Amino acid sequence: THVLRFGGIFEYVESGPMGAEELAFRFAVNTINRNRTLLPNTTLTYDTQKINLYDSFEASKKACDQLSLGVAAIFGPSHSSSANAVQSICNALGVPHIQTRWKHQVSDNKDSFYVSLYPDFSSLSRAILDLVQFFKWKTVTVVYDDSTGLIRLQELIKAPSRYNLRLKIRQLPADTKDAKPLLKEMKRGKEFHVIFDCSHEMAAGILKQALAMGMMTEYYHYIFTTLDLFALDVEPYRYSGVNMTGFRILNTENTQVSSIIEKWSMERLQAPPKPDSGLLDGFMTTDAALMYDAVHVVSVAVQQFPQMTVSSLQCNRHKPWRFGTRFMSLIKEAHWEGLTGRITFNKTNGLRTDFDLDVISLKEEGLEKIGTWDPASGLNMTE
Amino acid sequence: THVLRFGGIFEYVESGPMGAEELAFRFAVNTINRNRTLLPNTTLTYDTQKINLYDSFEASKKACDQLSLGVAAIFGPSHSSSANAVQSICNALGVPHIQTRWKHQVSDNKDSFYVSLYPDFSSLSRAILDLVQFFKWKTVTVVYDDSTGLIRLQELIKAPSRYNLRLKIRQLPADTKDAKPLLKEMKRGKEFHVIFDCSHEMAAGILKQALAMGMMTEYYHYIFTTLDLFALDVEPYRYSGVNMTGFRILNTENTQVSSIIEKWSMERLQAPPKPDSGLLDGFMTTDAALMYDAVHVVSVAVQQFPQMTVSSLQCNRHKPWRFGTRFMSLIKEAHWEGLTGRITFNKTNGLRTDFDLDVISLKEEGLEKIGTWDPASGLNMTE
Amino acid sequence: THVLRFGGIFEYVESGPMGAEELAFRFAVNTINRNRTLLPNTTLTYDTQKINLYDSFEASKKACDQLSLGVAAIFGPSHSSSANAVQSICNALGVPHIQTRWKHQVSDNKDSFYVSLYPDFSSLSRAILDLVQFFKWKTVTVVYDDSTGLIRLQELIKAPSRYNLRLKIRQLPADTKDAKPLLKEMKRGKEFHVIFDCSHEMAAGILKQALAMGMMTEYYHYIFTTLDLFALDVEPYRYSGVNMTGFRILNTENTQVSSIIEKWSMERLQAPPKPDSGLLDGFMTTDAALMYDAVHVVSVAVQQFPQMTVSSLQCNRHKPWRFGTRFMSLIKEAHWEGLTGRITFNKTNGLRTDFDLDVISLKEEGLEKIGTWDPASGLNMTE
Amino acid sequence: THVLRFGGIFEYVESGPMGAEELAFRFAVNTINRNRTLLPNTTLTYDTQKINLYDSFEASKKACDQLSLGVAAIFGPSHSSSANAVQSICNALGVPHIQTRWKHQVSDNKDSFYVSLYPDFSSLSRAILDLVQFFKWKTVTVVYDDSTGLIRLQELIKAPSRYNLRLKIRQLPADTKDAKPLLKEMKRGKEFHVIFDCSHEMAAGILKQALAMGMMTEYYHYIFTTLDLFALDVEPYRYSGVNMTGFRILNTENTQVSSIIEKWSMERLQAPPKPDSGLLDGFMTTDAALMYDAVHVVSVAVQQFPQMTVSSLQCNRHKPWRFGTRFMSLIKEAHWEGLTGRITFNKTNGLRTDFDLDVISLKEEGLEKIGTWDPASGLNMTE
Ligand SMILES: *[C@@H]1O[C@H](CO)[C@@H](O[C@@H]2O[C@H](CO)[C@@H](O[C@@H]3O[C@H](CO)[C@@H](O)[C@H](O)[C@@H]3O)[C@H](O)[C@H]2NC(C)=O)[C@H](O)[C@H]1NC(C)=O
Ligand SMILES: *[C@@H]1O[C@H](CO)[C@@H](O[C@@H]2O[C@H](CO)[C@@H](O[C@@H]3O[C@H](CO)[C@@H](O)[C@H](O)[C@@H]3O)[C@H](O)[C@H]2NC(C)=O)[C@H](O)[C@H]1NC(C)=O
Ligand SMILES: *[C@@H]1O[C@H](CO)[C@@H](O[C@@H]2O[C@H](CO)[C@@H](O[C@@H]3O[C@H](CO)[C@@H](O)[C@H](O)[C@@H]3O)[C@H](O)[C@H]2NC(C)=O)[C@H](O)[C@H]1NC(C)=O
Ligand SMILES: *[C@@H]1O[C@H](CO)[C@@H](O[C@@H]2O[C@H](CO)[C@@H](O[C@@H]3O[C@H](CO)[C@@H](O)[C@H](O)[C@@H]3O)[C@H](O)[C@H]2NC(C)=O)[C@H](O)[C@H]1NC(C)=O
Ligand SMILES: *[C@@H]1O[C@H](CO)[C@@H](O[C@@H]2O[C@H](CO)[C@@H](O[C@@H]3O[C@H](CO)[C@@H](O)[C@H](O)[C@@H]3O)[C@H](O)[C@H]2NC(C)=O)[C@H](O)[C@H]1NC(C)=O
Ligand SMILES: *[C@@H]1O[C@H](CO)[C@@H](O[C@@H]2O[C@H](CO)[C@@H](O[C@@H]3O[C@H](CO)[C@@H](O)[C@H](O)[C@@H]3O)[C@H](O)[C@H]2NC(C)=O)[C@H](O)[C@H]1NC(C)=O
Ligand SMILES: *[C@@H]1O[C@H](CO)[C@@H](O[C@@H]2O[C@H](CO)[C@@H](O[C@@H]3O[C@H](CO)[C@@H](O)[C@H](O)[C@@H]3O)[C@H](O)[C@H]2NC(C)=O)[C@H](O)[C@H]1NC(C)=O
Ligand SMILES: *[C@@H]1O[C@H](CO)[C@@H](O[C@@H]2O[C@H](CO)[C@@H](O[C@@H]3O[C@H](CO)[C@@H](O)[C@H](O)[C@@H]3O)[C@H](O)[C@H]2NC(C)=O)[C@H](O)[C@H]1NC(C)=O
Numbered sequence A, B, C, D: 001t002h003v004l005r006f007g008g009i010f011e012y013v014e015s016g017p018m019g020a021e022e023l024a025f026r027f028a029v030n031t032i033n034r035n036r037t038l039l040p041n042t043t044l045t046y047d048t049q050k051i052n053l054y055d056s057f058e059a060s061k062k063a064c065d066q067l068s069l070g071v072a073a074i075f076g077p078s079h080s081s082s083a084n085a086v087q088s089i090c091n092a093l094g095v096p097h098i099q100t101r102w103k104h105q106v107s108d109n110k111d112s113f114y115v116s117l118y119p120d121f122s123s124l125s126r127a128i129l130d131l132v133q134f135f136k137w138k139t140v141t142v143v144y145d146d147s148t149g150l151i152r153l154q155e156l157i158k159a160p161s162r163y164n165l166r167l168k169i170r171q172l173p174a175d176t177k178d179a180k181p182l183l184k185e186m187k188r189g190k191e192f193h194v195i196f197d198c199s200h201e202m203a204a205g206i207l208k209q210a211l212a213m214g215m216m217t218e219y220y221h222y223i224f225t226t227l228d229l230f231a232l233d234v235e236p237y238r239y240s241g242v243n244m245t246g247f248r249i250l251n252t253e254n255t256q257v258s259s260i261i262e263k264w265s266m267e268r269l270q271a272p273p274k275p276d277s278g279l280l281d282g283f284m285t286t287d288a289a290l291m292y293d294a295v296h297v298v299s300v301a302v303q304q305f306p307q308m309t310v311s312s313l314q315c316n317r318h319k320p321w322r323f324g325t326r327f328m329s330l331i332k333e334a335h336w337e338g339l340t341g342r343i344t345f346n347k348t349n350g351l352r353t354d355f356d357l358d359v360i361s362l363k364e365e366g367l368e369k370i371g372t373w374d375p376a377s378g379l380n381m382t383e
């Protein structure tokens, strides 16, 4: 009988229930504890702490508390300022750091003990660039929201120096959802081919404002960078004649994965979606799908390593954990068929640049898979 | 008799002498200790610690050591990953954090206790954009080096959506100085109007490689984003017929400032510039000029606040410093005429968006001031 | 066992080692003395004297000293003022005079006893004129250094009276290497097609100054009159996109000749090339290559004439040497395959107007043979 | 009573009488010996030797014979190959060398003991260049005879790089007076503005052949480089309507000079001019006029130096003559009003670049002075 303790550092909300990632972290730990073939005779427990996500000092205190109590991994603070602080703690004290969201990896950072399960925007900007070639675009307009979106789509911005695109980079307004002065300039500029770098909460907001202005016609085509395009109530836009392409790594066409999504709406039951926020009703985001996967990919590594004993490391007397070097190598060699497809890592750095997308577009009936993407193959679009 | 202790967290070098910022921090503290009108009867001492600059854990330990010994300010780790960790420590424990280099301020960071003395690239990208209007450019090519340079020049990249520029964003090769495959594509692409986002060490390297390929003619024009264009041995390029514009905030035309630059070459004497690195011989970089200024701008605040007593704060029992709220307000209200012009801060956030540049170009005689820039006025170019 | 004594009159240097011609004269005499098939059972010795090269009185004293001791040939004073004095001594006293450098032969000079091994500029000005036809030039600019260069390139200057060239004859500054006021007039005059009449020491100097001004672009083409274009460190100019044509009589593509060039760097070892003089490291000049050949071509004549006995001639009682008439006819009928190709003489006067050049140009990889020249054939340019 | 012995090295003719320079050397020495104010109580004697003029060995033997007998000056071998040999003898042994004909002074010749009385072609090529400006020429054709004529007229050849001339350099045939294939190309090329670099013997020959072909019309203009244009029987060309410009330094408009020219035809009486050689009957050439002057300019120096004693110098034991340094300085400071105008020398090198020409042209009446030239003033053409 073993007691492994996966750490976690999640968002602190005062009014609603626990977040989507903290639910999926608790739902995953309960899944391996019930299921018997994966990790027999062990009992995964958890040590979830809650932070502000914008406080690198508070994230570093909770990371040293989890190392003092003793963890075998830390499943990310999930924000760029807080994740870089906890990554360097986990690098110095041996213990792995599991990331499920994208952040800017600075080029001269010699950190080994981290893996990210979010699909890398080195690969995702090539998938978007393959679509604008397939659709024969020449007047692309990238619309992002925050200044880090330039780093995300940098291979798309450098594309007119190797092809015949003509980019017109624009930015959403600072914090307000008043995208109407942006969309007036896009409508007057005759820009019919738009790539949005947004989240699905902000994709839904500007799609209501593109309806009310001029822009949900059969002349406009919208590629979406977000992987949660399948979580939009697209009922006002089905008959609109529009073309709305995108991607989806959440492999919802398996019977096994769709079983878990149907289980997900049960225990989540609280926090209903407010009506003028036209996301769909019951779904896993790809944010929570990668946190459900991250517990399983580390679980592949602990099944291949049974003699693990959790130690109580100390930050101001920082010494590496005894099995931190081998167990990190088992996480970077782990293969898993999770909610988000195949999960293999990039041996050099530790990212997911090898993954399987599903190109989805908006048809009259609904929002349907019209192709596939694969870094080896490319676009296999059976449209 | 007072004993104020300004902290500092600088780069650790194993072979050469102390860095340019740590020299200028020691040279500034010795200057106020000698000079009598600024801070009478007090003695500024220092507590310089040395880190790797790429280790947010090591930067956070040295910041808690300086808070344990007791400081009244921390003069920056001077790298983006390390500065964001020490900013959140200084925000939680009251003590100000003085920054002298640019880093990405994420938009939802509610940090108050920090000021940056580096000229903001919100203002510097408008100064570069005013030059490409004045020079009547329409085929601009931005060349940057690291992925954060997109965030720096984002107002220049968004400019073809409000003017008639046609940007072609390119990137230098990853770490090597083999910019020849980049410059072949720029020469074959007939790109004569280039903006380089580099440092002066990398500006000197690609200017040697632009000479040897095709590109230092009278057809090519080079705007440089760096503020240390005046520190290039431009003797191979004076008669080249080229046009090489740029900026300079280091106000070298005063008798008072040029006295300090002449003092600077004396005590620095070690570490000579190697010959195939064609920077000039004796100069302050704008990196060290802002660290000389940062000690003085905080010195204006302590002259207006004589009853300051340094306290010994603790990180794991984090309580704000007693005078941290008032003394931070005096730093954000400080005015100073330093090496880099007028130093006034941006009351909203804490940046320098109000500063005085000097547009310099390459003439046959040398590298001379051909104008001025000011966020209020604009380009007053007496060419 | 014979003792033949070839005379020699070379440059007197006070600081460095012996000159390139005096080394090659000593290296050649040692070669025939070792090698057995050419001249069996004889031992060539030498009688090298050193002069100022600008003193026809001192050159005439050393020539009468060598005739008093007794020589069978004199291998040139190698300067125009000194060579004409020693030519008339050798004509009056019978003994041959071997020349390895060009000088102005006045038309009414009835001298028989001399041969020159330097390629005649009657033939070399036609080879340059064939290149400006092949390259379809019409705006040729000849740049020479001393006033005798007009005599050298006179068939190139008389060419617009039989073709459609438009010559613009210019001269380098008097003694200084300040060719920048010359190159300003050539750049402002839009003169992209330049023929330089220089030595390789002065070709290297003005190529550094053409780089620093405007002129090493892909618009400028430089034909070089010198036969030592292969002895330039052209590493700063390979990627420059320039076109730099020229000639080479030193037949470096044979295994036998390249063996001797590899032997040459061994014994020469002293006198390294100073860095800002960007000639290559180890090479025979064509000046020393013709002095290595001149000992061998005379050696062909003494193998065909075994009964030669060296006599002690006197200048103030001038009587011709007994075998001077026959042995001079054997030198003018000698054939040899030396370092500089085939060596046959011009029966009428005694020059080399029949020789084999190798047209070399500057490519991106290096400086490569792009054709051939031959007075019979013409340009066979397999470019 | 003194006995000064001026040396001389002149041409050896086998059939006719002594040459024009040797007559004028004997006529000048007889003139100072008769006349009493210039050199009282001294008796100039002479030591004229005769050479082949194309033998630098024979010229060097006669120069050492005159130094052995003892001379105070040597009045030139008067040919370029022979003069450079005797110049270096006179430089090494102290004794001055007086030149009366042009030769190529190589630029790195450090010879002090020589003066030339022939007008320098540095100044004479500017006088020809001032005429082609005054006559508003733009299609100039230079015709020379030997390859040294390029060195003579080099400032005229370099003139299209600073003005709007368009030179077409041509050469007379090698030795024959068959200039008809040259004049066919000049007539077919529509070249009406011709500069001839010739002697007056060859100017008369090609003027007979320009009459018989097409070219003595009112369309053709001929500038002559020779200073003996006044010695042409121009009676067939007076009414021809031609324009034939030229120069004249022989100052035939003085009563004193025209007395000497009338004396000259008396003692010369032998050697009549053959009819088909249409030079005039009785005249001093400027060759003999400068030899008459050269004895007088040296005579100014010996009047200012009475204690001169002629010494017997030796060539193979070469030691400078005791008063050679001072007496050479008196020749370079001598002023004289001779047959050829004012005779002042060029302190730097020793040439005549300051002289007074007389521009003469062909009118219907005869060949008349139409202007003046002076290096200070320029063309004062009272036409
Ligand atoms: C509960 O059972 C297993 C617990 O191990 C869960 O994961 C699976 O673990 C086994 C251990 O090697 C592997 O079996 C695979 O099962 C899938 C069923 O979809 C089948 O397609 C494969 O050929 C193989 O038999 C596998 O590593 C892993 N499954 C996957 C998809 O990676 C399993 O997910 C849990 N649920 C059920 C309903 O079994
Ligand atoms: C592990 O990580 C490295 C670096 O992230 C991966 O290297 C990258 O691999 C791709 C494919 O070889 C390189 O080229 C790109 O490929 C697309 C394929 O669609 C092609 O269309 C483009 O020509 C594009 O250049 C990419 O440059 C390369 N990056 C570097 C720095 O070498 C590597 O593939 C990963 N290993 C895996 C996934 O096994
Ligand atoms: C010691 O530090 C004091 C700092 O106050 C220096 O005194 C003054 O410092 C500033 C230079 O930043 C100057 O004051 C200003 O001058 C302008 C005109 O240039 C005037 O408009 C302002 O009202 C203000 O006075 C001033 O140059 C300088 N004072 C003097 C006399 O130079 C002081 O120079 C420092 N001492 C040493 C030895 O460096
Ligand atoms: C304190 O900070 C804020 C922002 O950090 C400063 O406001 C900024 O002011 C500039 C100039 O007025 C605005 O930028 C540009 O104005 C130019 C005028 O030519 C024009 O090309 C564009 O329309 C562009 O907007 C900038 O928008 C504005 N920032 C914000 C967020 O509104 C403010 O001036 C600072 N206070 C000081 C220096 O006292
Ligand atoms: C010693 O000198 C003799 C000179 O005869 C060298 O023998 C031969 O010299 C010439 C090189 O100039 C070559 O002869 C010719 O070769 C061509 C083919 O390359 C052939 O067509 C001719 O019929 C003639 O034979 C030849 O390379 C060379 N002989 C050998 C065996 O290499 C001899 O090489 C000199 N010895 C040394 C040690 O250098
Ligand atoms: C011995 O010497 C004489 C001259 O030193 C050589 O004669 C010269 O031969 C060349 C070539 O045939 C003639 O030059 C040029 O011919 C080209 C053919 O393309 C043409 O562009 C011109 O018409 C030009 O004349 C040159 O005129 C001629 N020289 C003389 C004085 O006739 C002779 O070939 C030598 N003997 C040998 C190498 O056996
Ligand atoms: C014979 O008499 C003198 C001998 O000395 C010859 O040359 C002249 O020498 C005197 C001595 O200084 C100078 O007199 C000048 O005479 C000319 C007459 O043309 C006059 O114009 C001057 O104002 C001055 O009085 C002078 O240096 C020199 N003459 C010249 C022209 O340079 C003279 O040439 C001989 N013949 C006659 C007829 O006197
Ligand atoms: C002594 O000899 C030197 C060198 O031969 C003479 O120097 C030369 O003098 C002229 C006049 O200053 C220079 O310029 C030329 O002048 C003409 C006048 O008509 C003018 O039109 C042109 O602009 C032309 O450049 C010439 O360059 C200069 N040479 C050198 C090497 O400096 C000097 O004048 C002589 N001294 C005398 C005659 O007192």
Ligand SMILES: *[C@@H]1O[C@H](CO)[C@@H](O)[C@H](O)[C@H]1NC(C)=O
Residues within 6 Å of the ligand: A135, A218, A219, A220, A221, A242, A243
């Ligand atoms: C949607 O996609 C189809 C197929 O690529 C294309 O024909 C159509 O024009 C697109 N709609 C747009 C661009 O509005």
Ligand SMILES: *[C@@H]1O[C@H](CO)[C@@H](O)[C@H](O)[C@H]1NC(C)=O
Residues within 6 Å of the ligand: A380
């Ligand atoms: C596209 O998918 C089909 C069906 O799975 C398969 O033939 C192959 O993977 C792809 N086709 C091509 C031509 O690559």
Ligand SMILES: *[C@@H]1O[C@H](CO)[C@@H](O)[C@H](O)[C@H]1NC(C)=O
Residues within 6 Å of the ligand: B135, B218, B219, B220, B221, B242, B243
């Ligand atoms: C540099 O300045 C000159 C003169 O103002 C002008 O050619 C242009 O502004 C620049 N040169 C270029 C772009 O070649």
Ligand SMILES: *[C@@H]1O[C@H](CO)[C@@H](O)[C@H](O)[C@H]1NC(C)=O
Residues within 6 Å of the ligand: B377, B380, B382
């Ligand atoms: C720019 O030039 C002068 C120099 O300082 C300045 O005084 C003037 O006011 C400015 N001109 C403008 C802003 O038009």
Ligand SMILES: *[C@@H]1O[C@H](CO)[C@@H](O)[C@H](O)[C@H]1NC(C)=O
Residues within 6 Å of the ligand: C135, C218, C219, C220, C221, C242, C243
């Ligand atoms: C050099 O060669 C290239 C290719 O043959 C051609 O541009 C031309 O011949 C030369 N280049 C010039 C004159 O710029």
Ligand SMILES: *[C@@H]1O[C@H](CO)[C@@H](O)[C@H](O)[C@H]1NC(C)=O
Residues within 6 Å of the ligand: C377, C380, C382
């Ligand atoms: C030039 O090229 C080849 C290569 O050596 C040569 O054999 C051939 O005879 C020549 N071709 C001609 C002269 O047409």
Ligand SMILES: *[C@@H]1O[C@H](CO)[C@@H](O)[C@H](O)[C@H]1NC(C)=O
Residues within 6 Å of the ligand: D135, D218, D219, D220, D221, D242, D243
């Ligand atoms: C001779 O000179 C006059 C005056 O310069 C000129 O008018 C005439 O045309 C000239 N004769 C020619 C060029 O044949």
Ligand SMILES: *[C@@H]1O[C@H](CO)[C@@H](O)[C@H](O)[C@H]1NC(C)=O
Residues within 6 Å of the ligand: D380
């Ligand atoms: C031309 O000569 C006249 C008369 O000798 C005289 O006025 C002056 O020297 C010259 N005139 C000018 C204007 O130079």
